[PDB]
Amino acid sequence: GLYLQVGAFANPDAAELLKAKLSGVTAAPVFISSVVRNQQILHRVRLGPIGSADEVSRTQDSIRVANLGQPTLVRPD
Ligand SMILES: CO[C@@H]1O[C@H](CO)[C@@H](O[C@@H]2O[C@H](CO)[C@@H](O[C@@H]3O[C@H](CO)[C@@H](O[C@@H]4O[C@H](CO)[C@@H](O)[C@H](O)[C@H]4NC(C)=O)[C@H](O[C@H](C)C(=O)O)[C@H]3NC(C)=O)[C@H](O)[C@H]2NC(C)=O)[C@H](O[C@H](C)C(=O)O)[C@H]1NC(C)=O
């Protein structure tokens, strides 16, 4: 499965809001992965798993149309 990251935030409310907005533009699962980085909590807003490269492309397009960020492929850890 393929995964996108749409943003990463120190403010968890910003991450939750972006997650909620993304659910309106994609059918793929949207989730927050929070990690410790540089002595702070970083809330990463991600989606997937997406089943194909073509669906990834169209999902990136939909996110840009919605002005929700510049989504990039990531691999989960
Ligand atoms: C190759 O390295 C990887 O590059 C990635 C490049 O995309 C990088 O991901 C990005 O990481 C940056 C931080 O480094 C992250 O930026 C956040 O950007 C948003 C804007 O989209 C900020 O939000 C806005 O802030 C302004 C005021 O500053 C507000 O007025 C505005 O309302 C905010 N917007 C929203 C929607 O709420 C955000 O700052 C707010 C204040 C917050 O933190 O809550 C920035 N955060 C930080 C911590 O700086 C950007 O979103 C993110 N892009 C994507 C697509 O994920 C990778 O770094 C991230 C952190 C990661 O590792 O997961 C790079 N990876 C590594 C390992 O270096």
Author numbering: 266 to 342
Give sentences copied directly from the paper behind this entry.
However, it is known that the sporulation-related repeat (SPOR) domains (Pfam 05036), ubiquitous in prokaryotes, play a central role in directing proteins to the septum by recognition of the unique septal PG (rather than recognition by other division proteins), which is enriched in denuded glycans, the PG devoid of peptide stems. Of all SPOR-domain-containing proteins, RlpA is the most highly conserved across bacterial species, which underscores its important physiological role in bacteria. It is predicted to have two domains, a catalytic “double-ψ β-barrel” domain (DPBB; Pfam 03330) and a C-terminal SPOR domain. In the present report, we disclose the X-ray structure of the SPOR domain of rare lipoprotein A (RlpA) from P. aeruginosa (SPOR-RlpA).
In order to characterize how the SPOR-RlpA domain interacts with denuded PG, we solved the X-ray structure of the complex with compound 1. Co-crystallization and soaking were both performed in parallel and resulted in two structures for the SPOR-RlpA:1 complex at near-atomic resolution (1.30 and 1.48 Å, respectively). The two structures are identical (rmsd of 0.16 Å for the 77 Cα atoms); the description provided herein is for the 1.30 Å resolution cocrystallization complex. The electron-density for compound 1 bound to the SPOR domain is excellent. The PG-binding site in the SPOR domain is located within the concave face of the β-sheet (the “palm” side in the top depiction of Fig. 4a), presenting a short funnel-like cavity (15 Å long by a width raging from 8–18 Å) in which the tetrasaccharide is ensconced in an extended conformation. The positions of the sugar units have been labeled 1 to 4, corresponding to NAM(1), NAG(2), NAM(3), NAG(4). The largest number of interactions is observed for NAM(1) (eight polar interactions with four atoms in the NAM), and to a lesser extent with NAG(2) (four polar interactions with three atoms in the NAG) and NAM(3) (five polar interactions with four atoms in the NAM). (iv) Several amino acids participate in the stabilization of the tetrasaccharide, but only the side chains of Q270, R302 and R309 are directly involved in the interaction with the glycan chain through polar interactions with oxygen atoms of the carboxylate of the lactyl moiety and the N-acetyls of NAM(1) and NAG(2). It is noteworthy that these residues, together with R311, build a basic patch critical for the binding of the carboxylate and acetyl groups of NAM(1). Most of residues contribute to the stabilization of the glycan chain by the formation of hydrogen bonds with the protein backbone (residues 271, 273, 275, 276, 333, and 335) or by stabilization of the hydrogen-bond network mediated by water molecules.
